[PDB]
Amino acid sequence: MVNPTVFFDIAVDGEPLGRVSFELFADKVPKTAENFRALSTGEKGFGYKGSCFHRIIPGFMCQGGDFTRHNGTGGKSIYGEKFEDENFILKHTGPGILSMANAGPNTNGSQFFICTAKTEWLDGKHVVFGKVKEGMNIVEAMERFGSRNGKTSKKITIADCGQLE
């Protein structure tokens, strides 16, 4: 079979780091993947090519993007507040793993966190539905510009994103 893939042009203060995609196992997590996909693809109806990153922990994991009604013109998980617990067929077995961190329990939303290291401490604490497709070098660069707490000096944002296949 074949799963959908989407890229995410990671920028740093205006300077694009390069290319960073993730292989979303829509086959195992279509309900969760369809979300990040429908958005990145734009089929969602509007999406949001930009987002913002201000929580990168070099040693545990990073952050994705959130938007609803904190700054304005927010959105959602292309299905209301969020969905329900789907499954964990893909347990964090190493770095470059994608998941959801919108809240945890029945809250896949779209607040993933680039797993920069097998997060076993979580143990089925979320829902995994992706994995660094290509350009891992980019994920390694960000870890260098991250603080051991969350915040960071540089501003990481998404310039462009869409389906690859």
Curated annotation (Swiss-Prot):
Ranges for domain PPIase cyclophilin-type: 7-163
Modified residues (N-acetylmethionine): M1
Cross-link (Glycyl lysine isopeptide (Lys-Gly) (interchain with G-Cter in ubiquitin)): K28
Subcellular location: Cytoplasm; Secreted; Nucleus
Effect of K125R: Loss of acetylation and interaction with TARDBP
Main location: cytoplasm
Phosphoserine, modified sites: S77
Record entry for activity regulation: Binds cyclosporin A (CsA). CsA mediates some of its effects via an inhibitory action on PPIase.
Entry keyword Zinc: no
InterPro entries: Cyclophilin-like_dom_sf (IPR029000), Cyclophilin-type_PPIase (IPR024936), Cyclophilin-type_PPIase_CS (IPR020892), Cyclophilin-type_PPIase_dom (IPR002130)
Consequence of changing F113A: Reduced ability to stimulate MAPK/ERK phosphorylation
Membrane-spanning segments: none
Keywords in alphabetical order: Acetylation, Apoptosis, Cytoplasm, Glycoprotein, Host-virus interaction, Isomerase, Isopeptide bond, Nucleus, Phosphoprotein, Rotamase, Secreted, Ubl conjugation
Modified residues (Phosphothreonine): T93
Enzyme class: isomerase
EC number, UniProt record: 5.2.1.8
N-acetylvaline sites (modified residues): V2
Functional summary from the UniProt entry: Catalyzes the cis-trans isomerization of proline imidic peptide bonds in oligopeptides. Exerts a strong chemotactic effect on leukocytes partly through activation of one of its membrane receptors BSG/CD147, initiating a signaling cascade that culminates in MAPK/ERK activation. Activates endothelial cells (ECs) in a pro-inflammatory manner by stimulating activation of NF-kappa-B and ERK, JNK and p38 MAP-kinases and by inducing expression of adhesion molecules including SELE and VCAM1. (Microbial infection) May act as a mediator between human SARS coronavirus nucleoprotein and BSG/CD147 in the process of invasion of host cells by the virus.
Family to which the UniProt record says this protein belongs: Belongs to the cyclophilin-type PPIase family. PPIase A subfamily.
Quaternary structure, from the entry: Interacts with protein phosphatase PPP3CA/calcineurin A. Interacts with PRPF19 isoform 2 (via N-terminus). Interacts with isoform 2 of BSG/CD147. Interacts with FOXO1; the interaction promotes FOXO1 dephosphorylation, nuclear accumulation and transcriptional activity. Interacts with integrin ITGA2B:ITGB3; the interaction is ROS and peptidyl-prolyl cis-trans isomerase (PPIase) activity-dependent and is increased in the presence of thrombin. Interacts with MAP3K5. (Microbial infection) Interacts with HIV-1 capsid protein.
Protein name per Swiss-Prot or TrEMBL: Peptidyl-prolyl cis-trans isomerase A
Organism from which the protein derives: Homo sapiens (Human)
Record lineage: Eukaryota, Metazoa, Chordata, Craniata, Vertebrata
Gene name of this polypeptide: PPIA
